């Protein structure tokens, strides 16, 4: 993906801490190097084809040096609690068509003018309980949205019973009426889905929606049918696909600017980030001033990325190594 | 009410020819992405600033 930069951004992956340049053995190692007079900070990093350093950070010219946890870069897949509005009728009115419209907004193109509209439908009948209704509409909402033949995954749709009320039973295009055997269904949960991701060419982007109801007559009045309230999300996508795209962009600042343009003829850069793991980010943002009447700042930033194992041990060892060599107050997260 | 804009490019982009792997598009005033065929990069820089 393409990001915005403050005039440059270069990324190093902190796979190891070796404390000196003579112990750099495998690819992706990191030492934070500085001298006794704490005026320059740089990172002798072991690339897959030798040892390489960074631009030399003047420690009087840092602006912010903030390290972020891996929980702060997870997109929370939003949910909606679709229920029966009890003000119109607590029971499904036995003759009406009960239709619900999903209004998607990023479709196959980014603007909110590229839209997509999908529907679920249940004819309500006499004696049909509300639990027999949500058993009948989550199937009809799954047959249109959780289908096998759609172009892109749109939503994930569950049912919530009144007994458990915390676990979600998934409803798909293959689930029948006999598989969902429960008589206390009270809502339909419509959750976002993670879209497909390709390294460098297809960024991590999502499709939002809004469950909108249609009008069903009660005593002559065409009253809107239901209510949809944004309940708190319980599923998040990891940081694996943002940092995997972040090494793909920032390697073109230190290296070749094009990536595959003409393929008998490219410089194959080997990347170090596994896209299947979560990662922490540390951004040392600084500048370069001179000594003249033309002095002021050419602003820069250096991103260091270490692997996150649950309690951020591989990142905090890097912060604990930068704090002693350079003497900065980077907050150990 | 007084508004302002700002955009910055390097001086390297003076006559940088766009070898179009994907065709370079313009953003219209309508919102549509229209296709363009101008090989210079700076035609798509002052068009997005007006």
């Amino acid at each position: 993906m393409v990001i915005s930069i403050n005039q440059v951004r270069q990324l190093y992956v902190a796979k190891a801490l070796k404390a000196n340049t003579a112990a750099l053995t495998t690819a992706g190692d990191i030492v934070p190097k500085a001298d006794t007079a704490k005026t320059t900070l740089y990172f002798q990093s072991m690339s897959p084809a030798g040892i390489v350093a960074s631009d030399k950070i003047n420690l009087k010219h840092v602006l912010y040096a903030k390290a972020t946890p891996s929980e702060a870069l997870a997109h929370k897949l939003v949910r909606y609690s679709v229920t029966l509005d009890a003000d119109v009728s607590a029971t499904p009115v036995a003759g009406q068509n009960y239709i619900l419209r999903l209004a998607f907004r990023q479709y196959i193109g980014l603007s909110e003018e590229d839209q997509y509209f999908k529907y679920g439908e249940v004819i309500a009948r006499s004696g049909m309980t509300a639990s027999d209704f949500y058993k009948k509409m989550a199937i009809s909402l799954a047959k249109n949205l959780e289908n096998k033949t759609e172009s892109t995954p749109l939503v994930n749709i569950y049912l919530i019973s009144a007994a458990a009320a915390s676990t979600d039973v998934p409803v798909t295009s293959a689930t029948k009426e006999s598989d969902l055997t429960a008589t206390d269904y009270n809502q339909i949960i419509i959750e976002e889905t993670e879209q497909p991701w390709v390294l460098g060419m297809m960024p991590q982007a999502f499709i939002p929606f809004t469950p909108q109801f249609l009008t069903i007559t009660v005593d002559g009045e065409d009253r809107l049918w239901g209510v949809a309230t944004v309940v708190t999300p319980t599923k998040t996508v990891p940081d694996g696909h943002l940092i995997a795209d972040l090494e793909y962009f920032c390697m073109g600042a230190r290296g070749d600017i094009y990536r595959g343009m003409g393929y008998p003829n490219i410089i194959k850069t080997t990347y170090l980030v596994d896209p299947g793991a979560v990662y922490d980010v540390l951004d040392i943002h600084y500048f370069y001033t001179g000594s003249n009447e033309s002095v002021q700042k050419s602003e820069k930033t250096i991103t260091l990325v270490a692997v996150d194992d649950g309690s951020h041990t591989a990142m905090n060892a890097l912060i604990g190594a930068i704090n002693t060599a350079s003497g900065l107050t980077i907050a150990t997260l | 009410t007084t508004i302002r804009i700002q955009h910055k490019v390097a001086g390297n982009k003076l006559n940088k020819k766009l070898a179009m792997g994907i065709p370079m598009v313009r953003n219209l005033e309508s919102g549509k992405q229209v296709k363009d065929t101008a090989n210079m990069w700076m035609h798509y820089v002052d068009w997005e600033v007006e």
Binding site: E112, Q212, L224, S298 | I3, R4, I5, L14, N15, D46
Partner: protein, 100 residues
């Protein structure tokens, strides 16, 4: 009906700004009631500061340098307003879900 700026949806579908009724012109007024105030003479200042190259104007070699870096910034600015002489000649009708 523009859904890029209008983000609140109406309960009956569409954006909430679609249900807003505006009668801009009530009768004739003998002068323009709504007009776009623009300053006479304030053309927008197209203004570039640059260094040794200028990628916009296409100038190689600069006699008067602002600074010493390969850069070229555009600065443009416009002073602008509008005026409605008689807002009592104009009746509106706004949905309350736009919250005034």
């Amino acid at each position: 009906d523009d859904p890029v700026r209008n983000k609140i949806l109406h309960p009956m579908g569409g954006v909430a700004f679609s249900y807003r009724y505006d009668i801009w012109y009530i009768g004739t007024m003998d002068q323009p009631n709504i007009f776009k105030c623009k300053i006479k003479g304030d053309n927008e200042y197209r203004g570039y500061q640059w260094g040794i190259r200028n990628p916009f104007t296409g100038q190689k070699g600069n006699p008067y340098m602002s600074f010493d870096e390969d850069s070229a910034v555009i600065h443009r600015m416009a002073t602008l307003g509008v005026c409605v002489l008689d807002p009592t000649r104009t009746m509106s009708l706004i949905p309350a879900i736009l919250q005034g």
